[PDB]
Amino acid sequence: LENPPPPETSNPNKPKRQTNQLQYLLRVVLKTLWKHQFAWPFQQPVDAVKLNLPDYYKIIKTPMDMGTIKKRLENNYYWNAQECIQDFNTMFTNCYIYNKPGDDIVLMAEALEKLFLQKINELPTEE
Numbered sequence: 001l002e003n004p005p006p007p008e009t010s011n012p013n014k015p016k017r018q019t020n021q022l023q024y025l026l027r028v029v030l031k032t033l034w035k036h037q038f039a040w041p042f043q044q045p046v047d048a049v050k051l052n053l054p055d056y057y058k059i060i061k062t063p064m065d066m067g068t069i070k071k072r073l074e075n076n077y078y079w080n081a082q083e084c085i086q087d088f089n090t091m092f093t094n095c096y097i098y099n100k101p102g103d104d105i106v107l108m109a110e111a112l113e114k115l116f117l118q119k120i121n122e123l124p125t126e127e
């Protein structure tokens with residue numbers, strides 16, 4: 001099986017804006033998570049060919065990773081903060097679906113999710 005192409009990150013047919021919440025999601029939330037020691041397996045799409053995980057994309061139909069989220073924020077892909085937050089949530093839940101509870105990669109995702117939820121509690125005031 002081939003890896004699927006990565007998720008779309010730019011679309012000039014989608015309207016574009018910068019907002020206080022989107023700026024915070026890139027500069028504070030993504031930046032904090034990205035620099036965490038456990039972030040490295042989530043910085044790019046799961047490369048199922050490289051990892052010899054041929055069943056990954058037989059089960060995970062909405063892949064998501066922080067590299068894609070970073071590119072979406074840099075390309076003004078998201079109009080609402082919730083769209084970005086939904087992508088982080090999808091990345092975590094994909095991990096909890098494919099991997100057995102308590103496995104290494106799940107424990108890494110759980111620590112990142114706890115930090116993510118703490119930062120989302122400090123989302124700045126909307127326009």
Ligand SMILES: Cn1cc(-c2cc(NS(=O)(=O)CC(F)(F)F)c3ccn(C(C)(c4ccccn4)c4ccccn4)c3c2)cc(NC(=O)Nc2ccccc2F)c1=O
Nearest residue numbers: 040041042043044045046047048051095098099100104105
């Ligand atoms: C979200 N996500 C991400 C990865 C993942 C991604 C990688 N690189 S990447 O290029 O894809 C993404 C990038 F660039 F950002 F790093 C690598 C490169 C090496 N590794 C390890 C050593 C590994 C394992 C556990 C914890 C940490 N590192 C690895 C991988 C495969 C087999 C053994 N060890 C990776 C793991 C795996 C998942 N799941 C998984 O590996 N599940 C699994 C494996 C074997 C048996 C049972 C399983 F469920 C999953 O969900």
